């Protein structure tokens, strides 16, 4: 990364305070946080990444051929096994956490 530049700027961060997520199945669900079971704090961390913004330029993504393509940066998910809770029952499930930001083209008509 040397004088090299992303096309979608992205900001990644460690997310200990995560309390909601979406079942891989697609089923909204909740996570655990404080969980002061045993005088401890436990905690589940995740490494989330999202977009600085949709259109880092007026044209869209940074440095596409704005003349033929429209572009827009979106966020890409990935899945993690982590501890969830669907109502009364709480088990391990896979949650769709954000993980990168990548640009998506579409052509122009004429």
């Amino acid at each position: 990364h040397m004088g090299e530049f992303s096309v979608c700027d992205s900001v990644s961060v460690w997310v200990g305070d995560k309390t909601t997520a979406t079942d891989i199945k697609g089923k909204e669900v909740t996570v655990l946080a404080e969980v002061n079971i045993n005088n401890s704090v436990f905690r589940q961390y995740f490494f989330e990444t999202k977009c600085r913004a949709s259109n880092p330029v007026e044209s869209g993504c940074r440095g596409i051929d704005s003349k033929h393509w429209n572009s827009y940066c979106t966020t890409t998910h990935t899945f993690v096994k982590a501890l969830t809770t669907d109502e009364k029952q709480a088990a391990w499930r896979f949650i769709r956490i954000d993980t990168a930001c990548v640009c998506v083209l579409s052509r122009k008509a004429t």
């Binding site: 051929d65 391990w92 499930r93 052509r107 004429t110």
Partner: protein, 162 residues
Amino acid sequence: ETCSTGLYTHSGECCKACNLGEGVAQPCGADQTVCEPCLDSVTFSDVVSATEPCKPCTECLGLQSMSAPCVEADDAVCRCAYGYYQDEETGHCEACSVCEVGSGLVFSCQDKQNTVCEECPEGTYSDEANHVDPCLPCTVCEDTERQLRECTPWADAECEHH
């Protein structure tokens, strides 16, 4: 004390169902049901029954590539391998047809959906035939730069100058 399960212990009482991730260990005959958590990657109770135990994790083979892994709560789901899609009339994994030259990609080859190509319209072209590239716009030289190959539905234009 409505029994949800529909099964009753001999004593008359209502039977304890086994929730998700819990399958039946010993049925509610003499006594209540005994539930035990499922083994990960191996078994799963994706139901709340006082009858059903931990079923065995669906395995993926051949063109069965995995989409969702198997967990106590839910079974693993397989889907067609990278190359292919599920055929609604063959129940079998057939491979994504490619977008031949002079043609490009439009919608990709999803689980149930075959590649959708398109004849490269006025001003576009296809280098090759695959299920990845779409039609690209043609170079335009310059009113200055001499024009050698003009742009065809199947190959870009070519040019050079002084």
